[PDB]
Amino acid sequence: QWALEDFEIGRPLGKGKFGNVYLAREKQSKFILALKVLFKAQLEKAGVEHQLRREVEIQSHLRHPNILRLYGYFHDATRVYLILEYAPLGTVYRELQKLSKFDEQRTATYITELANALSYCHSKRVIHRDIKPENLLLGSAGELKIADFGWSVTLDYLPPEMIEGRMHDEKVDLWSLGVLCYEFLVGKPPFEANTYQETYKRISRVEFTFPDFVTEGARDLISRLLKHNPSQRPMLREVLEHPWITANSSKPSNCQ
Ligand SMILES: CCc1cccc(CC)c1NC(=O)n1cc2c(c1)/C(=N\C(=O)c1ccc(N3CCN(C)CC3)cc1)N=N2
Numbered sequence: 431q432w433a434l435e436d437f438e439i440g441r442p443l444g445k446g447k448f449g450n451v452y453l454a455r456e457k458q459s460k461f462i463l464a465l466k467v468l469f470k471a472q473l474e475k476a477g478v479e480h481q482l483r484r485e486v487e488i489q490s491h492l493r494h495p496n497i498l499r500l501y502g503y504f505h506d507a508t509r510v511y512l513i514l515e516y517a518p519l520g521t522v523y524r525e526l527q528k529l530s531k532f533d534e535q536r537t538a539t540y541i542t543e544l545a546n547a548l549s550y551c552h553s554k555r556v557i558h559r560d561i562k563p564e565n566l567l568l569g570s571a572g573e574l575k576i577a578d579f580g581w582s583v584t585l586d587y588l589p590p591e592m593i594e595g596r597m598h599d600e601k602v603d604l605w606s607l608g609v610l611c612y613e614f615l616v617g618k619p620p621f622e623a624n625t626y627q628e629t630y631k632r633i634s635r636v637e638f639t640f641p642d643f644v645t646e647g648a649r650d651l652i653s654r655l656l657k658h659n660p661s662q663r664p665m666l667r668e669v670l671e672h673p674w675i676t677a678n679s680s681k682p683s684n685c686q
Pocket residue numbers: 443444445446447449450451464466514515516517518519520521564565566567577578
């Protein structure tokens with residue numbers, strides 16, 4: 431039974447489309463965490479209010495070192511409050527901008543961490559959508575934390591494009607791992623182009639190239655993940671066992 435009065439609210443940590451995050455200390459436990467304030471109006475304006483309610487619900491049952499922890503949540507007339515884990519090292523995206531690009535060990539380790547977390551959710555019948563660097567936070571020990579809340583558990587007149595979206599949902603994160611792996615090593619997304627339109631075509635036609643410095647092991651893994659056909663994409667287990675990942679990762683791969 432939470433209330434804003436239960437916290438000592440400190441400095442802002444970021445502003446988003448739907449809300450703001452602040453650093454906070456729980457008066458009771460003198461425990462440092464992050465308070466996310468979401469504006470119901472913004473959520474409704476985008477028709478995601480009902481969606482979030484369900485995602486937060488799923489999250490409250492997820493417990494994993496590489497998934498940003500949701501300690502609880504509450505609300506009032508116009509706000510939704512999320513009591514979240516405080517990740518002191520910022521986002522992966524920020525870190526990547528700071529270093530330009532990651533080496534193989536850093537990259538492989540992050541990929542393993544994501545795969546381990548996704549693998550765990552899979553075993554709880556929970557699926558994840560696309561993953562962006564902007565939604566990955568870093569813990570004090572440098573561990574990555576999935577922090578978006580993209581979780582989830584007629585047809586006759588719909589065309590492939592509108593249908594293929596709602597099917598093979600369990601293969602979307604695999605494509606994302608491939609994109610993240612490429613960006614971590616190269617410094618830019620593989621389908622980044624000049625225009626909104628150009629980017630579409632690149633992704634759709636699955637056309638991209640590897641800079642010379644990208645080793646063979648990494649090209650193999652990325653190429654297997656970035657396949658147009660979702661069923662052609664490997665299983666999370668295959669990622670966790672890929673020679674390049676196990677060789678370079680410093681974090682033990684733990685499937686399921
Ligand atoms: C703003 C709301 C929002 C919208 C969309 C996506 C996200 C996920 C990142 C969020 N944030 C969110 O949920 N948040 C939950 C969070 C959270 C954000 C967070 N930490 C930080 O944002 C942060 C930023 C900079 C930082 N630095 C320290 C070292 N450097 C010297 C300078 C920088 C250290 C920590 N911990 N839990």
